[PDB]
Amino acid sequence: KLSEQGVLDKLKNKWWYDKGECGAKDSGSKEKTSALSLSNVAGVFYILV
Amino acid sequence: GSTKEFFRRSKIAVFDKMWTYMRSAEPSVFVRTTAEGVARVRKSKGKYA
Description:
The structure is cut from a larger assembly and holds 2 copies of chain A. In chain A, 51% of the residues lie in helices and 0% in strands.
C-alpha cells in the first residue's frame, strides 16, 4: 500500500537528496573562467628551443 | 512572524522548494530582528537576500 501511494519514494527522496550536503544545482551553479597557464602552451616553447 | 508562517503552510510548488532549503540550511539564514536582517544584506557582498 505504501509503495503504490509513493510514500516509499517520498521518504527516499527526503533522506538521500534533501539531507545531501551538495546538491545537483549546488555544483552546477559555480562557474568561473581562468587565464591560460604555461602548461597549456608549453609545447610550443619546446619546439622553439 | 507571519512571513515565516507563509512559507511553512504553503502548497505552491515554488514556495515548497524555498521552505525546504531554508529548513535544512547551516548556518541559520533566519535572523532575530529586522535591523539585523538589513545589516546582513549590506555586509555579505551580495550573497544574502
